[PDB]
Structure formats: C-alpha cells, structure tokens
Amino acid sequence: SGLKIGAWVGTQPSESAIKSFQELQGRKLDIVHQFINWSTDFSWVRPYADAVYNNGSILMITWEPWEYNTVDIKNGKADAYITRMAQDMKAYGKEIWLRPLHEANGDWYPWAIGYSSRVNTNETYIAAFRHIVDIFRANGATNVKWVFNVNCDNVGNGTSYLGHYPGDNYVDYTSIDGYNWGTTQSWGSQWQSFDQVFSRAYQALASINKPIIIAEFASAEIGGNKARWITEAYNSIRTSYNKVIAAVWFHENKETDWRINSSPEALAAYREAIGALEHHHHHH
C-alpha cells in the first residue's frame, strides 16, 4: 500500500489534537489538514506545523483568500503577503502541501468561478494561481507542493472541473472534496455512496498526469449505513481510484456529525478499513 491517510481532526492540529485522533483511529496520520485565510501569517501556523512534522506527518494547508478575489490576486494586490508567506515557508523547509483558491467550481467562496459577484473567470483564476506559484518559486520555496482542487460537483454558473486548471507546470497534485450528506440537508440531499460522490470529478482529473488527493471526504449517519459506506469507500479507493495517493477525512461534529466515531459501528468500520493499508514505520 502506498495510500496515505490524513485528517482534519476537528480542531487546529495541536500535538494533543493529533494524538487524540490517532488514538481514536488506531493509526498514525500521514497527513494533517489545517485551514487558514489570507490574513494568517506563517508565524501563527508555525507551532502547528511543528506539531505535525514532529509527529512524522505532512501538513496540508487550505489557504482561503476571503481577503482577495482572483482579480485582486492576479493584479498583484496581495503580493507582499504572498511573498512573505513564501519566504517563511522556504525557511521552514519541510514539505508542505498548499491548497490555495479551493473549490472554485462551486458558488460559495468569493474567489470561485460560480460566485455571484461574477468577478472570477477561468482566466482570472488561472492567472491568480500561476502568480502565486511564480512568487513561491522566485523565493525558493520548492518544498511547497501545489494542490489544485475541485468540489465533487460543479455548482453555479460557469463552473467545470478543468476550465480553471492552471496547467501541469503549476500543479503537483490535483484533489477532490466531497461529502455524503445522507438525507440531512433541507434542500433535499440524498444518500450517495463514495463512488456516486466522487466518480465524475475523478474521471475528469484522471485525464491529467498528476497524482490525486481526496482532500476532504466524510459521510453522515442519516439516510443509510455509514459503516458500510466507509468500508465501501476505502475498497473503492483501492480498486477503482488508483490514481488517488491520499485520503483525508473531515472529522468534525459542529453541524452534521462527520466524525469517524459518529457511532460505534462507523468507528469500527473506519479502523478496519485503514488497517488493510500497509504499516509505514516512521523515524526522523
């Protein structure tokens, strides 16, 4: 097995939070996920990065530009902030997976192509993403790996899996986010298997010669059997999604109970599923 296992552990990934989640799933994390905005300096990330790297994991950062849309970023309005982040990440030196401008084929983020301001187009998005990558490269931050992302579904006008793809020269990994909402959402959500959630986006990304990360996935309990969903998800990943190199759960219970331990059955299924994956002994 090469498949790496990751999580957002429900809170910022302090040493204690990482340990708690590892105790729960019964396995060391390969990847730990954290979310920041474009007001966050790397000095704030620093203590969390140290916890993740000390643990023997890679940090995946989703870097959310609430502060700057794709026009602002492509035009250079954020460049001082970008430059400092690049400099700080270069100096830190460890491998970091960075996911800027994510889910841009939805309509809920102000940088997304589907967003109703109509400011973001394929062209502004591509220019923005390339501009970020260029600044990081100019500052030597080759330890930062670039993660392109799509939502499992295209939501909003003008959205597509690949129209905003910035090119192989600017991308190290592609990625998908997707959730089985079960029957939990009033807008009429339905139970969907992992394959139902992810297949379409995977088919699209599989046409690009980059490895694929399932950067966020989880299932609700309501409307079906979440334990079976988990078992089937990992089996699908192994058998039918062989370009996927990492699976990163979204473990949280603020609204929908996405947690791996939303019930005893789900937890047992999760532990059993990841236990099929080869043990990777870690040492620094």
Curated annotation (Swiss-Prot):
GH26 domain boundaries: 17-270
One of the GO biological process terms: cellulose catabolic process
Entry keyword set: Carbohydrate metabolism, Cellulose degradation, Glycosidase, Hydrolase, Polysaccharide degradation, Signal
Entry GO CC: cell surface; extracellular region
Active site, renumbered: 103, 216
Source superkingdom: Bacteria
Gene Ontology molecular function, alphabetical: beta-glucosidase activity; cellulase activity
Protein role: This enzyme catalyzes the endohydrolysis of 1,4-beta-glucosidic linkages in cellulose, lichenin and cereal beta-D-glucans.
Family affiliation: In the N-terminal section; belongs to the glycosyl hydrolase 5 (cellulase A) family.
The protein's name: Endoglucanase H
Taxonomic lineage: Bacteria, Bacillati, Bacillota, Clostridia, Eubacteriales
Encoding gene (name): celH
